[PDB]
Amino acid sequence: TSWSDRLQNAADMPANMDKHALKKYRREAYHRVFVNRSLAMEKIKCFGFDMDYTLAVYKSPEYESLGFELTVERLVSIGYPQELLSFAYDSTFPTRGLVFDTLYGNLLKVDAYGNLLVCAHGFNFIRGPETREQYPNKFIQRDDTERFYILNTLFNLPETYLLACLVDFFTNCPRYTSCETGFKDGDLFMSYRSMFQDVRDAVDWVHYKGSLKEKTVENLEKYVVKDGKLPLLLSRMKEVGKVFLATNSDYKYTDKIMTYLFDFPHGPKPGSSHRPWQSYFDLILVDARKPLFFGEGTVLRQVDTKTGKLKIGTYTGPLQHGIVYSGGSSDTICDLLGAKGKDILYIGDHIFGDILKSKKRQGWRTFLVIPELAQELHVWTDKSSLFEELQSLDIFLASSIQRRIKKVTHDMDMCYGMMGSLFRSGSRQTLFASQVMRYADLYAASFINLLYYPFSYLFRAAHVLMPHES
């Protein structure tokens, strides 16, 4: 049972809009919207969306497996060894938000301060004392972006696993000699950095120049979660405010995915006429180039929706019905919708490019979609006894207790996968968790959970007090 299985099971259910039914449903963690900072829904005038892994959640592990297979085939085609073809995607290995250290070839799980929680070289998990050789302070400087790459999106799951496969492969293949910073093969030296760059390039290529999109769209039911409640929520949002799309995807791909997401024999609710996906949006913007979008952005262009090509020139005209924009900036949205940042709730899955950047650069309100939460919630509740035990031990310690703490931490983490929870390793929160709390005003397993709250709901979070104020 993957997180997408959970999401699809919930997507299959019709909306019961009886107000008591709604209250009961949203009390379940699965259908709840979680609150980091208080947000009065009555003050939101514009609801903005990302598409991929927000509106269009790709099914797991099928979509990751497809990306993996095509990325491997691209690497082989440029001259990586044939043994790569014997790799098979394994969903139990990668957790999102890991850091690849391009100097030493390690996947790292870190906290908000760059402290090492987990270090794997290939499939070898390096324990504390051994990590000190390469990380003397068990710490990385994560903003050293030339060295460290943070694998922040669900698109990075395939390459997270592939990096580990490759390091494992070269390390154990007697054709190659392992060095500190890569592999020697006679007169050829392959650094972990140049290897990482090849993987990154092959991933981009598969999405942009390869067959991934074509294979996705030829079997959308296999690859994409679909939910009859989506037009209902969007139509309700449009009753109290404006609705926009701002996506990095191009027009042709957006049109294919979005058509599928609305492809039901009805519109907002069963019995109503179907309407085109475009009719649910006051403003549609593609090729957004987030996060650059939230600063200078790019030249505002107009899509010719008939051909899917951009019209020649900068678009200087007004917002008109049926127009589709390309590029621009977040200011385009504010100016055309008559909005200020705090009137906007932007809904996306990219913790950096969607959420942190719109928050820091523009003061937008933020809603983070975390698709894996759909299944992490199940583990969290099902294994609560292990977390509680750890919480009791930590308090008792403040030795056989220290070893017990390490053992319980391991058992708890393994319930999530080999790289543990997205949100923690034992009692230590990850960088990703800390960024969620600081930048996402609201978060949930799905944006659909907004449907279960009334129009002027006040999302509440307790005030933060300093230690001396307590």
The region of 98-106, 119-127, 349-357, 374-382 touching Mg ion under the rule CB under 5 A is 349-357
Instruction: Give me the residue label for tokens 């009753």.
Output: 239
When asked if residue 380 is in the footprint of its own copies (CB under 8 A), the reply is yes
Nearest CA to 333 out of 366, 367, 297 is that of: 297
**Partner that binds at residue 433, options its own copies, Mg ion, none, CB closer than 5 to 8 Å by kind:** its own copies
Burial (CB count <10 Å: 0-12, 13-18, 19+), residue 420: buried
Point out the catalytic residue in the list 52, 101, 255, 354.
52
When asked if residue 50 is in the footprint of Mg ion (CB under 5 A), the reply is yes
Q: What mask of x and - would describe binding to its own copies in positions 6 to 35, judged by CB under 8 A?
A: -----------------------x--x-xx
When asked if residue 437 is in the footprint of its own copies (CB under 8 A), the reply is yes
188-191 and 242-246 strand pairing: unpaired
CA distance 90 to 100: 18
Q: Is 255 a catalytic residue?
A: no
Q: Is 101 a catalytic residue?
A: no
CA distance 344 to 359: 11
- Whether residue 122 contacts residue 34, with contact meaning beta carbons closer than 8 Å, is answered with no
When asked if residue 53 is in the footprint of Mg ion (CB under 5 A), the reply is yes
Binding residue positions for Mg(2+): 50, 52, 349
Nearer to Mg ion, 55 or 202 (CB): 55
**Partner that binds at residue 53, options its own copies, Mg ion, none, CB closer than 5 to 8 Å by kind:** Mg ion
The region of 45-53, 55-63, 276-284, 361-369 touching its own copies under the rule CB under 8 A is 361-369
When asked if residue 143 is in the footprint of its own copies (CB under 8 A), the reply is yes
Residues in region 261-320 near Mg ion by CB under 5 A? none
End-to-end CA distance of the chain: 43
In eight-state DSSP terms, residue 273 is P
Nearer to Mg ion, 116 or 233 (CB): 233
Give residues with Cβ within 8 angstroms of 356, minimum separation 6. 435, 439
DSSP string across 46-104: EEEE-TBTTTBPBPTTHHHHHHHHHHHHHHHHTT--GGGGG----TTS--TT-EEETTT
**Partner that binds at residue 50, options its own copies, Mg ion, none, CB closer than 5 to 8 Å by kind:** Mg ion
Q: What mask of x and - would describe binding to its own copies in positions 388 to 427, judged by CB under 8 A?
A: ---x--x---x------------------------x---x
Residues involved in catalysis: 50, 52
